[PDB]
Design an enzyme around this catalytic site. Structure first.
Site, PDB file in Angstrom:
ATOM      1  N   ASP A   4       0.903   2.576   7.808  1.00  0.00           N
ATOM      2  CA  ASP A   4      -0.251   1.861   7.270  1.00  0.00           C
ATOM      3  C   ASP A   4       0.112   0.517   6.669  1.00  0.00           C
ATOM      4  O   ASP A   4       0.133   0.319   5.446  1.00  0.00           O
ATOM      5  CB  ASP A   4      -1.101   2.687   6.308  1.00  0.00           C
ATOM      6  CG  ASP A   4      -2.486   2.081   6.113  1.00  0.00           C
ATOM      7  OD1 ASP A   4      -2.745   0.965   6.644  1.00  0.00           O
ATOM      8  OD2 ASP A   4      -3.322   2.725   5.447  1.00  0.00           O
ATOM      9  N   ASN A  15       0.697   7.277   2.684  1.00  0.00           N
ATOM     10  CA  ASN A  15       1.243   6.360   3.673  1.00  0.00           C
ATOM     11  C   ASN A  15       2.715   6.626   3.978  1.00  0.00           C
ATOM     12  O   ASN A  15       3.400   5.754   4.516  1.00  0.00           O
ATOM     13  CB  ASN A  15       0.983   4.916   3.247  1.00  0.00           C
ATOM     14  CG  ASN A  15      -0.483   4.578   3.286  1.00  0.00           C
ATOM     15  OD1 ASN A  15      -1.246   5.230   3.996  1.00  0.00           O
ATOM     16  ND2 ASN A  15      -0.892   3.555   2.544  1.00  0.00           N
ATOM     17  N   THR A  25      -4.715   1.004  -3.591  1.00  0.00           N
ATOM     18  CA  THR A  25      -5.230   2.186  -4.270  1.00  0.00           C
ATOM     19  C   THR A  25      -4.928   2.110  -5.761  1.00  0.00           C
ATOM     20  O   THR A  25      -3.757   1.979  -6.139  1.00  0.00           O
ATOM     21  CB  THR A  25      -4.581   3.428  -3.659  1.00  0.00           C
ATOM     22  OG1 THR A  25      -4.890   3.477  -2.259  1.00  0.00           O
ATOM     23  CG2 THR A  25      -5.082   4.698  -4.318  1.00  0.00           C
ATOM     24  N   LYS A  57       2.187   4.645  -1.102  1.00  0.00           N
ATOM     25  CA  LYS A  57       1.662   5.835  -1.763  1.00  0.00           C
ATOM     26  C   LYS A  57       1.949   7.016  -0.843  1.00  0.00           C
ATOM     27  O   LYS A  57       2.261   6.812   0.335  1.00  0.00           O
ATOM     28  CB  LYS A  57       0.152   5.710  -2.008  1.00  0.00           C
ATOM     29  CG  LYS A  57      -0.642   5.440  -0.750  1.00  0.00           C
ATOM     30  CD  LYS A  57      -2.107   5.289  -1.068  1.00  0.00           C
ATOM     31  CE  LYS A  57      -2.915   4.887   0.155  1.00  0.00           C
ATOM     32  NZ  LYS A  57      -4.364   4.940  -0.193  1.00  0.00           N
ATOM     33  N   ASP A  80       0.833  -1.201   0.000  1.00  0.00           N
ATOM     34  CA  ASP A  80       0.000   0.000   0.000  1.00  0.00           C
ATOM     35  C   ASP A  80       0.869   1.254   0.000  1.00  0.00           C
ATOM     36  O   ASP A  80       0.537   2.262   0.629  1.00  0.00           O
ATOM     37  CB  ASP A  80      -0.968  -0.016   1.190  1.00  0.00           C
ATOM     38  CG  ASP A  80      -2.211   0.849   0.967  1.00  0.00           C
ATOM     39  OD1 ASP A  80      -2.511   1.205  -0.197  1.00  0.00           O
ATOM     40  OD2 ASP A  80      -2.885   1.172   1.973  1.00  0.00           O
TER      41      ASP A  80
HETATM   42  O1  LIG Z   1      -1.357  10.689  11.134  1.00  0.00           O
HETATM   43  C1  LIG Z   1      -0.631   9.666  11.668  1.00  0.00           C
HETATM   44  C2  LIG Z   1       0.351   9.922  12.618  1.00  0.00           C
HETATM   45  C3  LIG Z   1       1.090   8.878  13.162  1.00  0.00           C
HETATM   46  O2  LIG Z   1       2.043   9.159  14.090  1.00  0.00           O
HETATM   47  C4  LIG Z   1       0.849   7.572  12.748  1.00  0.00           C
HETATM   48  C5  LIG Z   1      -0.135   7.324  11.785  1.00  0.00           C
HETATM   49  C6  LIG Z   1      -0.417   6.035  11.357  1.00  0.00           C
HETATM   50  C7  LIG Z   1       0.658   5.013  11.622  1.00  0.00           C
HETATM   51  C8  LIG Z   1       0.388   3.688  11.239  1.00  0.00           C
HETATM   52  C9  LIG Z   1       1.476   2.844  11.296  1.00  0.00           C
HETATM   53  C10 LIG Z   1       1.403   1.502  10.979  1.00  0.00           C
HETATM   54  C11 LIG Z   1       0.174   1.002  10.602  1.00  0.00           C
HETATM   55  O3  LIG Z   1       0.056  -0.287  10.262  1.00  0.00           O
HETATM   56  C12 LIG Z   1      -0.963   1.821  10.530  1.00  0.00           C
HETATM   57  O4  LIG Z   1      -2.136   1.210  10.145  1.00  0.00           O
HETATM   58  C13 LIG Z   1      -0.856   3.182  10.830  1.00  0.00           C
HETATM   59  C14 LIG Z   1      -0.875   8.365  11.247  1.00  0.00           C
END
Ligand SMILES: Oc1cc(O)cc(/C=C/c2ccc(O)c(O)c2)c1
Length: 274
Positions: free
Chosen positions: A158, A141, A177, A138, A136
């Site tokens: 993400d 992310n 996406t 992009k 994913d």
């Molecule tokens: O706006 C933000 C700020 C942050 O500090 C972290 C995230 C998301 C991190 C994330 C990391 C790993 C993952 O698997 C996931 O679903 C989300 C989003």
């Protein structure tokens, strides 16, 4: 695997909402015991076996298991996991410079693009070395630690589609996406680390031009363009871009995954290698 089932509010105070998506919301939080700040990602659980809302336990556990494995400066760090009847809550490293997507909305030079790209490649090199496909990749992310510096440091986030690729490929109808998915995803073919390298080529094209190489008027057009490798370097966008930068992209936007540059190839490519 079961997670901490104490009330997350007993240990953290939440604040500003950082983002939200189809089954998740991310809120800034502060741990009461340390005063340290994090991002709390609340992922909505599936409420029944045959439901389509929320995220299946298997998918949540896969994401958590991958996050627990990774520790690298260019990948987000998972701190803790909580859960209750409705959500799994990932306590994640706080990255406060926003999405690379939003930074780009504010076209880069090749130096600025490569400064970002080199960090992405280093993070992806780390993941692929662990046989983890992100699936994913992009700009949405890719988070920046501080967007008010000349060369922002980034972290990949993400991992909701990420998979361990211990047999060289996975055949699971993973699908992210449309603008960023590789032809093998579009065609529902077995998938491996190579799909991330295609996505990096798309990212690089966008970084250099501000334009999305395969984007059509509808999702089906985008997907059709991806499968046909229907893109070109428009002179209006790329006239001052070096041929070596285009060469990098062209060797990633390759339909046959076996002929696409690997992450190691991308690091040795003359546009990237010092
Ligand atoms: O706006 C933000 C700020 C942050 O500090 C972290 C995230 C998301 C991190 C994330 C990391 C790993 C993952 O698997 C996931 O679903 C989300 C989003």
């Amino acid at each position: 695997t079961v997670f901490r089932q104490e009330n997350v509010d007993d240990y953290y105070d939440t604040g500003e909402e950082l983002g939200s998506g189809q089954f998740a919301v991310v809120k800034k939080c502060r741990e009461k015991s340390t005063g340290l700040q994090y991002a709390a990602k609340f992922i909505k659980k599936r409420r029944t076996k045959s439901s389509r809302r929320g995220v299946s336990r298997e998918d949540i556990e896969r994401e958590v298991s991958i996050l627990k494995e990774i520790q690298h400066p260019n990948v987000i760090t998972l701190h803790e996991v909580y859960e209750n009847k409705t959500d799994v809550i990932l306590i994640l490293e706080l990255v406060a410079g926003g999405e690379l997507f939003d930074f780009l909305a504010e076209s880069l030079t090749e130096e600025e693009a490569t400064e970002f790209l080199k960090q992405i490649l280093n993070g992806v090199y780390y993941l692929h070395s662990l046989q983890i496909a992100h699936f994913d990749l992009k700009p949405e992310n890719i988070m920046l630690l501080d967007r008010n510096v000349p060369k922002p440091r980034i972290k990949i986030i993400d991992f909701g589609l990420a998979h361990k690729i211990d047999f060289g490929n996975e055949f699971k109808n993973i699908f992210g996406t449309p603008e960023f998915v590789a032809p093998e995803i579009v065609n529902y073919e077995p998938l491996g680390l190579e799909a991330d390298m295609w996505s990096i080529g798309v990212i690089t094209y966008i970084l250099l031009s501000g334009a999305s190489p395969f984007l059509g008027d509808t999702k089906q057009e985008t997907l059709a363009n991806v499968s046909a490798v229907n893109y070109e370097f428009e002179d209006e966008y790329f006239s001052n871009t070096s041929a070596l930068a285009k060469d990098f992209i062209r060797r990633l936007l390759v339909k046959d995954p076996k002929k696409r540059m690997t992450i190691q190839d991308s690091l040795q490519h003359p546009w990237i290698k010092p």
